[PDB]
Enzyme design. Structure first.
Site, PDB file in Angstrom:
ATOM      1  N   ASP A 114      -4.037  34.258 -23.376  1.00 46.90           N
ATOM      2  CA  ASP A 114      -5.095  35.045 -22.752  1.00 46.90           C
ATOM      3  C   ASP A 114      -6.038  34.090 -22.033  1.00 46.90           C
ATOM      4  OD1 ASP A 114      -7.133  36.812 -22.011  1.00 46.90           O
ATOM      5  OD2 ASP A 114      -7.087  37.903 -23.909  1.00 46.90           O
ATOM      6  N   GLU A 173      -8.948  40.112 -28.907  1.00 45.81           N
ATOM      7  CA  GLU A 173      -8.227  40.523 -27.702  1.00 45.81           C
ATOM      8  C   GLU A 173      -6.728  40.253 -27.752  1.00 45.81           C
ATOM      9  OE1 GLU A 173     -10.488  38.405 -24.779  1.00 45.81           O
ATOM     10  OE2 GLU A 173     -12.090  39.905 -24.702  1.00 45.81           O
ATOM     11  N   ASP A 177     -12.631  47.252 -23.831  1.00 45.49           N
ATOM     12  CA  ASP A 177     -12.474  45.845 -23.489  1.00 45.49           C
ATOM     13  C   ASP A 177     -13.732  45.409 -22.751  1.00 45.49           C
ATOM     14  OD1 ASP A 177     -11.739  43.296 -22.713  1.00 45.49           O
ATOM     15  OD2 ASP A 177     -10.263  43.960 -21.234  1.00 45.49           O
ATOM     16  N   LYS A 213     -21.405  37.572 -21.375  1.00 45.19           N
ATOM     17  CA  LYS A 213     -20.519  37.253 -22.484  1.00 45.19           C
ATOM     18  C   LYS A 213     -20.505  35.759 -22.776  1.00 45.19           C
ATOM     19  CE  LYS A 213     -15.940  38.632 -24.159  1.00 45.19           C
ATOM     20  NZ  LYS A 213     -14.614  39.147 -23.728  1.00 45.19           N
TER      21      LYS A 213
HETATM   22  N1  LIG Z   1      -4.700  37.259  -8.378  1.00 43.89           N
HETATM   23  C1  LIG Z   1      -5.510  36.432  -9.074  1.00 43.89           C
HETATM   24  N2  LIG Z   1      -5.336  35.100  -9.034  1.00 43.89           N
HETATM   25  C2  LIG Z   1      -6.143  34.283  -9.725  1.00 43.89           C
HETATM   26  N3  LIG Z   1      -7.159  34.696 -10.492  1.00 43.89           N
HETATM   27  C3  LIG Z   1      -7.443  36.003 -10.616  1.00 43.89           C
HETATM   28  C4  LIG Z   1      -6.612  36.970  -9.898  1.00 43.89           C
HETATM   29  N4  LIG Z   1      -7.102  38.183 -10.194  1.00 43.89           N
HETATM   30  C5  LIG Z   1      -8.155  38.001 -11.033  1.00 43.89           C
HETATM   31  N5  LIG Z   1      -8.356  36.697 -11.284  1.00 43.89           N
HETATM   32  C6  LIG Z   1      -9.401  36.097 -12.151  1.00 43.89           C
HETATM   33  O1  LIG Z   1      -9.396  36.690 -13.448  1.00 43.89           O
HETATM   34  C7  LIG Z   1     -10.711  36.665 -13.997  1.00 43.89           C
HETATM   35  C8  LIG Z   1     -11.031  37.976 -14.705  1.00 43.89           C
HETATM   36  O2  LIG Z   1      -9.884  38.492 -15.375  1.00 43.89           O
HETATM   37  P1  LIG Z   1     -10.106  39.454 -16.642  1.00 43.89           P
HETATM   38  O3  LIG Z   1     -10.721  40.759 -16.189  1.00 43.89           O
HETATM   39  O4  LIG Z   1      -8.848  39.487 -17.473  1.00 43.89           O
HETATM   40  O5  LIG Z   1     -11.201  38.597 -17.436  1.00 43.89           O
HETATM   41  P2  LIG Z   1     -12.073  39.278 -18.593  1.00 43.89           P
HETATM   42  O6  LIG Z   1     -11.153  39.829 -19.661  1.00 43.89           O
HETATM   43  O7  LIG Z   1     -13.092  40.170 -17.930  1.00 43.89           O
HETATM   44  O8  LIG Z   1     -12.814  37.959 -19.152  1.00 43.89           O
HETATM   45  P3  LIG Z   1     -12.714  37.498 -20.698  1.00 43.89           P
HETATM   46  O9  LIG Z   1     -11.474  38.191 -21.219  1.00 43.89           O
HETATM   47  O10 LIG Z   1     -12.592  35.994 -20.603  1.00 43.89           O
HETATM   48  O11 LIG Z   1     -14.007  37.978 -21.319  1.00 43.89           O
HETATM   49  C9  LIG Z   1     -11.658  36.417 -12.835  1.00 43.89           C
HETATM   50  O12 LIG Z   1     -12.340  35.176 -13.017  1.00 43.89           O
HETATM   51  C10 LIG Z   1     -10.788  36.332 -11.601  1.00 43.89           C
HETATM   52  O13 LIG Z   1     -11.183  35.246 -10.769  1.00 43.89           O
HETATM   53 MG   LIG Z   2     -10.157  40.010 -21.558  1.00 43.15          MG
END
Ligand SMILES: Nc1ncnc2c1ncn2[C@@H]1O[C@H](COP(=O)(O)OP(=O)(O)OP(=O)(O)O)[C@@H](O)[C@H]1O
Ligand SMILES: [Mg+2]
Lengths: 603, 63
Positions: free
Chosen positions: A193, A170, A7, A69
């Site tokens: 998502d 995803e 991922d 990304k």
């Molecule tokens: N408890 C929470 N409340 C609100 N937002 C959160 C919390 N925990 C994480 N986030 C938000 O989630 C985001 C990242 O989550 P995630 O790792 O699923 O994204 P990602 O999969 O890396 O990004 P993408 O899938 O869009 O490429 C961050 O911007 C963060 O601010």
């Molecule tokens: Mg993701």
């Protein structure tokens, strides 16, 4: 070998593998299951990925890359790319062919290289766990990725020294990760998502026929540039406006202050997902001519909700569109599941739950489901899981530009892939040397309002009357969702060579060179790891020797004590540096002089 | 060139619900993703799809 699942997130990355019959996510070197998607280039030539890069970003802002990304597969003149250009600490620049690149230490670098550094960290983690080399991986992309983005990610995987078996969307991966628990039956699910950079919605049907799970994607929609980063941006803008309002200073000039302010801002958002009010408290944020300034701002949950409400509402429209394309109503959705860290926000859960009139599931880990889904997909490709099949679709209509600028659809959105579509083209004028086809992706009615995949030129058409020759062009969409255009002479069958102009992405030459540079950077990073370990050995030797001196006490020749202490100080100085050779030399010298002490040990 | 109905193996008057059952099991058999082997399966599968797509549409089925 084994096919690991990666991922590759906008904000955090994650790698999971298939322990026989049970996939598991692997902790990285620091013991975290999720690795930040941050890449730093030090002065000394090392490369930092994840939490170390995150740590040293304040002292190396221009060379600490993040949210790559949200640049990969995009053009420099794209609107979102320009807006990000003004915002980001590092330098985003136009490439030679117009693609969006970044400049690190005066070198022009393509997003697939940086994302390939992250991929390399994931691959090395998987190798460390497995104890054998890893050469094959499944990598995740958002469902709404265009062609150029998907191909760019595949290229980042190739630069990482990986043979990319499958680019998986995803929400689809999360869907089967959710689906392995369930037994025989028919369900329809909505996967919502909302990550750090991208938003996807997918309507997927899961039927079980003869012990063979069928995951059919009914519809998909989303926005590849909507995520947590923009929530952060809203809160930042509010904090800046309030600070300029109360103290008279526009804080957007100080890049260090803006870094501290984004950190504090995201921290406050996450803190407001479970509290009712927090304080953004930044002392000595900036220095006025009169004296240093401070920030201490109350933020209620209601304030944040008001600040990001229109962003949340921006995600509801693709729900309507996707349900329309799937031909379903809200009441036909048997289950709805939330994926992505940003869905942890109470308001998002409430708005989604009220759209569907139903409470989303609670037994889904939004941070770990995508990766384990990817691992399982790799298992499907090898054969270790034979009971599951995935039928994905392409998210965007593929068409060509015709007279007047109107676009003509050849393959409509939500078509199950892999798929093929052939069409006959001919000349329009007498002795036409060649024909040129403009291929684009999108739903808009004007060709200019869509994403151009490029202009495909069929040269070498021998002279003929207008309209006589027949050339069949074949448009392929493989299981990755990527386009492959081949041509052929209709009547004879003789192939037709295709020249792609005005296109995006890296080509074979760029790819090869960047693979070699990736290997060189890999050896350099090995040497950096060596220097870290050697520094540890040096500190241990310092401690051991000083302890032994104290134990020896007066029973040590004053000349020996003097020389040993000088050697110690020299070694301490070498340990503060970044030269392995000097450290090892100083260690050796210290041993030579401390011979008498080691003799004094005597068991 | 080959008969739609016959490559899936259908009665030619069976209803949409059945042709969907046949498509899913044939998609299982001939998916490249599943076997991973060759383009031959993906080339065949693309046609099994193409038949499933024309036969679920009412008007195009009459044609
Ligand atoms: N408890 C929470 N409340 C609100 N937002 C959160 C919390 N925990 C994480 N986030 C938000 O989630 C985001 C990242 O989550 P995630 O790792 O699923 O994204 P990602 O999969 O890396 O990004 P993408 O899938 O869009 O490429 C961050 O911007 C963060 O601010
Ligand atoms: Mg993701």
């Amino acid at each position: 070998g084994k096919i690991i699942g990666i991922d590759l997130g906008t904000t955090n990355s994650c790698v999971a593998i298939m322990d026989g019959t049970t996939p598991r996510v692997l902790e990285n070197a620091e013991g975290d299951r999720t690795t930040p998607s941050i890449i730093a280039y030090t002065q000394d030539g090392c490369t930092l990925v994840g939490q170390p890069a995150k740590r040293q970003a304040v002292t190396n802002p221009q060379n600490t890359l993040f949210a790559i990304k949200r640049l990969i597969g995009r053009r420099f003149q794209d609107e979102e790319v320009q807006r990000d250009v003004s915002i980001m600490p590092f330098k985003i620049i136009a490439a030679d062919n117009g693609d969006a690149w970044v400049e690190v230490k005066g070198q022009k670098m393509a997003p697939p290289q940086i994302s390939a550094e992250v991929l390399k960290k994931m691959k090395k983690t998987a190798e460390d766990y497995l104890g054998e080399p890893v050469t094959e991986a499944v990598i995740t992309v958002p469902a709404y990725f265009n062609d150029a983005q998907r191909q760019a990610t595949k290229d980042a995987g190739r630069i990482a020294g990986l043979e990319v078996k499958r680019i998986i969307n995803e929400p689809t991966a999360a869907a089967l990760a959710y689906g392995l628990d369930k037994g025989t039956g028919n369900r329809t699910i909505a996967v919502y998502d909302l990550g750090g950079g991208a938003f996807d919605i997918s309507i997927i049907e899961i039927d079980e026929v003869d012990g063979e799970k069928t995951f059919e994607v009914l519809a998909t929609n989303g926005d590849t540039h909507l995520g947590g980063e923009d929530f952060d941006s809203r809160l930042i803008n509010y904090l800046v406006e309030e600070f300029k309002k109360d103290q008279g200073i526009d804080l957007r000039n100080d890049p260090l202050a803006m870094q501290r302010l984004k950190e504090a801002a995201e921290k406050a958002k996450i803190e407001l997902s479970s509290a009712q009010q927090t304080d953004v408290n930044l002392p000595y944020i900036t220095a006025d001519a009169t004296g240093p300034k401070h920030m201490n701002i109350k933020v209620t949950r209601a304030k944040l909700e008001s600040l990001v409400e229109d962003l949340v509402n921006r995600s509801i429209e693709p729900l309507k569109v996707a349900l329309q394309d799937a031909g379903l109503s809200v009441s036909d959705i048997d289950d709805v599941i939330l994926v992505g860290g940003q869905t942890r926000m109470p308001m998002v859960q409430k708005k989604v739950a009220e759209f569907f009139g139903k409470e989303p599931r609670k037994d889904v880990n939004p941070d770990e489901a995508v990766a384990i889904g990817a691992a399982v997909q790799g298992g499907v490709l090898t054969g270790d899981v034979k009971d599951v099949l995935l039928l994905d679709v392409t998210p965007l209509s593929l068409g060509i530009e015709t007279m007047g600028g109107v676009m003509t659809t050849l393959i409509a959105k939500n078509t199950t892939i892999p798929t093929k579509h052939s069409q006959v083209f001919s000349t329009a004028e007498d002795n036409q040397s060649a024909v040129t086809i403009h291929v684009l992706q999108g739903e808009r009615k004007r060709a200019a309002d869509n994403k151009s995949l490029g202009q495909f030129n069929l040269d070498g058409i021998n002279p003929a009357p207008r309209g006589m020759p027949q050339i069949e062009v074949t448009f392929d969409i493989d299981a990755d969702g990527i386009l492959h255009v081949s041509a052929k002479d209709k009547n004879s069958g003789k192939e037709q060579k295709i020249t792609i102009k005005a296109s995006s992405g890296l080509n074979e030459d760029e790819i090869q060179k960047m693979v070699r540079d990736a290997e060189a950077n890999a050896e350099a990073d090995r040497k950096c790891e060596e220097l870290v370990q050697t520094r540890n050995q040096g500190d241990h030797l310092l401690h051991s020797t000083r302890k032994q001196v104290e134990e020896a006490g007066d029973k040590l020749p004053a000349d020996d004590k003097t020389a040993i202490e000088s050697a110690l100080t020299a070694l301490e100085t070498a340990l503060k540096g970044e030269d392995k050779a000097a450290i090892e030399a100083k260690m050796q010298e210290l041993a030579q002089v401390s011979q008498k002490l080691m003799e004094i040990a005597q068991q | 060139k080959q008969d739609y109905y016959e490559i899936l193996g259908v009665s030619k008057t069976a209803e949409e619900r059945e042709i969907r059952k046949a498509y899913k099991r044939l998609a299982m058999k001939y998916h490249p993703d599943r076997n991973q082997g060759d383009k031959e399966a993906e080339a065949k599968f693309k046609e099994i799809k193409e038949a499933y797509e024309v036969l679920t549409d009412s008007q195009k089925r009459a044609a």
